[PDB]
Amino acid sequence: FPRVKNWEVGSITYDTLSAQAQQDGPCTPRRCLGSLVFPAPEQLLSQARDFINQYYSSIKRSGSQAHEQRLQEVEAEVAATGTYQLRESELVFGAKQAWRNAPRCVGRIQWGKLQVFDARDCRSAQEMFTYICNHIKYATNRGNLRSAITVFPQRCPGRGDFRIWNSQLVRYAGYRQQDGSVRGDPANVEITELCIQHGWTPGNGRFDVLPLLLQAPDEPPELFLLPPELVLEVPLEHPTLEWFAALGLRWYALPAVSNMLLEIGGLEFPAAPFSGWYMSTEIGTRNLCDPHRYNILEDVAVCMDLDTRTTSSLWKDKAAVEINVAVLHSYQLAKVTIVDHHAATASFMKHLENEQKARGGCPADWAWIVPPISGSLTPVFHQEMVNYFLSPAFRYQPDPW
Amino acid sequence: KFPRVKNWEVGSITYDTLSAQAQQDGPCTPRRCLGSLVFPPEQLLSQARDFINQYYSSIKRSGSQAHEQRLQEVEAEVAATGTYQLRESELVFGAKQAWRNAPRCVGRIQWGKLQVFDARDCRSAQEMFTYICNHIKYATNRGNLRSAITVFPQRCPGRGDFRIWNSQLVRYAGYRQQDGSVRGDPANVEITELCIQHGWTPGNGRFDVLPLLLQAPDEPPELFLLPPELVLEVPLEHPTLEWFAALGLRWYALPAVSNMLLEIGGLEFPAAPFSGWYMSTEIGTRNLCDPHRYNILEDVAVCMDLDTRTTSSLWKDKAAVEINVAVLHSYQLAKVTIVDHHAATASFMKHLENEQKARGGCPADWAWIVPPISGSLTPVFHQEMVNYFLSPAFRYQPDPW
Ligand code: HEM
Ligand code: HEM
Ligand SMILES: Nc1cccc(CCCCNCc2cccc(OCc3ccc4ccc(N)nc4c3)c2)n1
Ligand SMILES: Nc1cccc(CCCCNCc2cccc(OCc3ccc4ccc(N)nc4c3)c2)n1
Ligand SMILES: [Cl-]
Ligand SMILES: [Cl-]
Ligand SMILES: [Gd]
Ligand SMILES: [Gd]
Ligand SMILES: [Gd]
Ligand SMILES: [Zn+2]
Secondary structure (H helix, E strand, O other), X not given: OOEEEEOOOOOXXXXXXXXXXXXXXXXXXXXXXXXXXXXXXXXXXXXXXXXHHHHHXXXXXXXXHHHHHHHHHHHHHXXXXXXXXXXXXXXXXXXXXXXXXXXXXXXXXXXXXXXXXXXXXXXOHHHHHHHHHHHHXXXXXXXXXXXXXXXXXXXXXXXXXXXXXXXXXXXXXXXXXXXXXXXXXXXXHHHHHHHHHOOOOOOOOOOOEOOEEEEOOOOOOEEEOOOHHHOOEEEOOOOOOHHHHHHOOEEEXXXXXXXXXXXXXXXXXXXXXXXXXXXXXXXXXXXXXXXXXXXXXXHHHHXXXXXXXXXXXXXXXXXXXXXXXXXXXXXXXXXXXXXOHHHHHXXXXXXXXXXXXXXXXXXXXXXXXXXXXXXXHOHHHHEOOEEOOXXXXXXXXXXXX | OOOEEEEOOOOOEEEOOHHHHOOOOOXXXXXXXXXXXXXXXXXXXXXXXXXXXXXXXXXXXXXXXXHHHHHHHHHHHHHHHOOOOXXXXXXXXXXXXXXXXXXXXXXXXXOOOOEEEEOOOOOOHHHHHHHXXXXXXXXXXXXXXXXXXXXXXXXXXXXXXXXXXXXXXXXXXEEOOOOOOOEEOOOOHHHHHHHHHOOOOOOOOOOOEXXXXXXXOOOOXXXXXXXXXXXXXXXXXXXXXXXXXXXXXXXXXXXXXOOOEEEEOOEEEOOOOEEOOEXXXXXXXXXXXXOOOOOOHHHHHHHOOOOOOOHHHOHHHHHHHHHHHHHHHHHHHOOOOEEOHHHHHHHHHHHHHHHHHHHOOOEOOHHHHOOOXXXXXXXXXXXXXXXXXXXXXXXXXXXXX
């Protein structure tokens, strides 16, 4: 059992939960690949068995009446149909566990508070769009955001998958410019080109909300525009740099990842978008300051009258800090939920202690948990972590085009 | 079997073929990644043959003349004595490779410029002290720092080791109190207590340079006071915050690690202090601002009149950036070599590119290469890395008690 030290305090724990790691990661004794972004009924049966055991553990009913019945029921259904169906309560438990198990998520202190929308009856792309609009409306909640996931029908033989082609429900377009540059968000150039290819009339702003490409089984994707009043946005201003408003920057309230696969007990849900609320560094540091994103850092530093000709003035650090200040200030001003990296990392430390007592460990990806500014100022920097894969899980999947 | 390595800022892809050469096994398995953890008779000929092979290919002399000749004398030396002596060029070459191979060092663009002092004929704590004093004065060079390593005698059976008991050549004292808490450097507390326990006269202050505890083979260690004119220190002040200097903060010029074990061609040098020059975040961010180190972040924020009542004011980030500004400013004002984390990381990217051409890859520890402030503002944040152990190497080693 790996020993895990906290260097700020001297605390030591052992991660016995990693021993239960089923699926394997990319590291070996030869070489660590931890920093890489992207690392048969009988095997269906073992994953289902393990999940049913997890569920009956959670309802304090392991080895009971209901428990063995469900095990036999699932087996019989796998033998008879090649697959099986989750009960509603098992689905809710599985979606929360998938969040709880996600090693790159710093917000997991919230894992138990997740609104699960059961869309497993969804029949079409048009119904899919309706469900998604209701997810966005519920989750946004006029700025008082609520964690939620909508679960569309599982993958099954004989039918194609439900897929949301967009990587998030709200994304800004990225238009390859006249002179080779990108207007808008360069992360979204491909999906922008897919929307235009599918009949979307593009805009030419920097913050144009993209339409949804929604794929029903064995159907080409269909284009659906989000009603503007559903997509809550926050104009960015700075509490003391009044010229900051003139940059014309905005961001959207609702982070809703829509391209990941949800796995529960061997069943796969290729379409199960989930949403929380932002941590300010995601917007202020990554989305706005990455050289390959909006890349505003030099423009801000220049307007701040910093000396950008030498790196040792720390003009980059100073401009990034104020961009994060602006993000927090603007979201608070707009009354839209947001958490800063200090509050977020501190609550993740409480999560780790909770999980050590609950399960004997917690899978965590240090490189993703530690925030992208002010790393060692947060408590998670000084916390060793063990990364491993537990199921139920959220997993990357290939793009459907 | 050749790990694909992507840079996410630029889109570029490489393959680490060097990873195939990994000798010692890391802590990672396919079921769990332990990359974030700080600390995870004729087999001598195997690592000796291998090292001699490296040396001769590096001078473009594989399979010719002195190579086979030198292959035989090491064979003869081990058959006749159970070990062997390195030629001076090999000791030099091996020292540079251990540096080049250190996966946690962001300064390795400098690896080819290293001054190697050969103390293999050393034999007494008094003899070491003069060596360590040559080094320090050579390395410091009146503030124009030069990289350097002194190699004390290798380890042999039947005889105790040369060991430097301090973790660095320069360390500030840490004194416990009538109430537990520490005046000075909390990280050194323990060696401070050993130094006193061997007859040192403890000062009272927050920046008392500790004496050296030098251990000759099979002897208790002797205390050695360093000449105060030999230990170059930098009083910390801030370009525009005139009160910063009044906080009385200082740091020393020479970072010289003195507790690691140099391994070359199966040979083990438990006393081999190496020194470079500081990256400003090592002092400004970790040494001064870690909660378990000098922990000055709050004192600076009070002086800056910052709103320390709410985390979302980012007062910690603001205070931290100014402390790093102070470090860079003070070191430059004193003309003591220092490198900021932007310059340092940009040079490492250049090092990765060189190493890709030269050896086909580079073992790199993402968690230690990315700086502790402004992580994603530096290019190494967006660079995938492969971590693995190559030899020659610097390795951690137990404390000699
Ligand atoms: C409630 C507030 C939440 C916060 C503050 C939060 C925060 C974060 C952050 C900062 C990341 C890293 C993103 C990046 O750097 O690219 C992340 C990743 C992730 N989060 Fe959370 N999250 C929240 C809610 C949720 C919910 C509700 C779910 C699912 C039910 C979830 C699942 C995940 C997953 C799967 C990842 C990994 C994404 C990837 O690998 O690309 N999070 N989260
Ligand atoms: C010349 C300028 C140099 C710079 C700017 C530099 C910078 C750094 C930094 C920032 C670290 C991270 C340590 C930490 O975060 O506590 C590090 C680690 C390390 N450096 Fe370098 N270094 C330099 C020279 C050298 C030299 C000359 C050697 C050996 C010959 C060396 C070998 C190492 C090793 C082995 C580590 C890992 C130490 C550990 O794990 O504690 N470095 N360096
Ligand atoms: N509030 C909330 C609530 C719910 C969910 C989320 C997460 C938003 C997730 C968006 N997923 C974007 C993404 C995916 C893959 C790679 C990305 O960038 C590449 C990259 C390269 C190197 C890295 C090194 C360290 C590190 N930590 N990240 C890296 C990312 C972005 N947020
Ligand atoms: N200029 C230069 C030049 C040459 C050499 C150096 C290195 C200075 C070494 C001082 N240090 C050594 C050390 C050893 C072990 C632990 C340490 O700290 C604890 C800790 C815990 C978690 C971490 C997670 C990530 C990360 N990056 N570091 C961590 C450090 C320090 N410097
Ligand atoms: Cl985002
Ligand atoms: Cl240091
Ligand atoms: Gd102003
Ligand atoms: Gd402008
Ligand atoms: Gd004042
Ligand atoms: Zn690993």
